[PDB]
Amino acid sequence: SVIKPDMKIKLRMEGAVNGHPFAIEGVGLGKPFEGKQSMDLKVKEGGPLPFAYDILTTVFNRVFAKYPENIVDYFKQSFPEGYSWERSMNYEDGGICNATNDITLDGDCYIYEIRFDGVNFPANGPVMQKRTVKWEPSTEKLYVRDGVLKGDVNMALSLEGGGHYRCDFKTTYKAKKVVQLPDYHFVDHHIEIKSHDKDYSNVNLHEHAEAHSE
Numbered sequence: 508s509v510i511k512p513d514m515k516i517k518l519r520m521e522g523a524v525n526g527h528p529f530a531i532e533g534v535g536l537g538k539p540f541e542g543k544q545s546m547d548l549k550v551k552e553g554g555p556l557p558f559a560y561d562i563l564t565t566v567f568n569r570v571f572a573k574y575p576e577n578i579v580d581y582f583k584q585s586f587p588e589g590y591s592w593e594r595s596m597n598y599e600d601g602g603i604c605n606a607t608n609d610i611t612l613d614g615d616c617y618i619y620e621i622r623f624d625g626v627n628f629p630a631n632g633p634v635m636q637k638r639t640v641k642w643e644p645s646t647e648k649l650y651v652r653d654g655v656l657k658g659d660v661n662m663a664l665s666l667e668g669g670g671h672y673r674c675d676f677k678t679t680y681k682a683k684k685v686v687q688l689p690d691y692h693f694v695d696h697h698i699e700i701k702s703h704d705k706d707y708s709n710v711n712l713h714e715h716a717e718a719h720s721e
């Protein structure tokens with residue numbers, strides 16, 4: 508089959524935050540049918556990153572989500588051709604991040620061409636001050652619109668001093684070929700940085716995702 512139980516990941520992110528350019532590359536592996544994945548990320552340019560690494564993590568593939576048999580899988584259907592996604596991440600203090608990921612497939616390895624751009628993060632805010640701890644688990648709401656798939660999610664970053672920092676995600680997924688469209692459904696997520704060094708030049712990221720419906 509096109510989608511194998513065990514697959515790889517190759518990616519390169521080029522981006523900027525408040526005008527500060529940077530570049531990150533990574534390699535990883537995951538189990539598409541189990542909804543689990545892991546990757547090692549290395550900052551190649553712009554290091555050391557002057558902002559909270561957490562704003563980048565959800566940008567570093569919904570194929571890695573366990574879909575039950577009674578819910579159409581827009582993502583696994585899209586291959587070998589693949590799909591691409593666009594997303595705006597609106598933080599409560601005005602910081603806004605736009606990201607895109609063009610996903611292709613070469614053998615058993617997915618290739619990500621990522622672009623990330625964030626602006627208006629206050630200098631004394633939790634992102635520029637690196638006050639974030641982690642993203643809380645979430646439930647993404649997916650629905651069809653204009654022949655493509657939308658995914659919206661209320662995200663929250665736990666803060667070092669206590670409390671949370673909210674962000675609203677709005678993603679558009681676009682398959683590179685005609686695939687069956689799903690009915691309204693959900694995808695639970697839980698992304699975690701398992702390990703990292705002092706300035707985050709090296710990061711080990713993990714994610715577990717499962718779809719569910721009414």
Ligand SMILES: [Mg+2]
Nearest residue numbers: 523526527528
């Ligand atoms: Mg730039």
Ligand SMILES: [Mg+2]
Nearest residue numbers: 600629631632
């Ligand atoms: Mg302020």
Ligand SMILES: [Mg+2]
Nearest residue numbers: 632633638666
């Ligand atoms: Mg803070």
Ligand SMILES: [Mg+2]
Nearest residue numbers: 651652653654
């Ligand atoms: Mg419609």
Ligand SMILES: [Mg+2]
Nearest residue numbers: 550554555708
């Ligand atoms: Mg570095």
Ligand SMILES: [Mg+2]
Nearest residue numbers: 693719720721
């Ligand atoms: Mg449900």
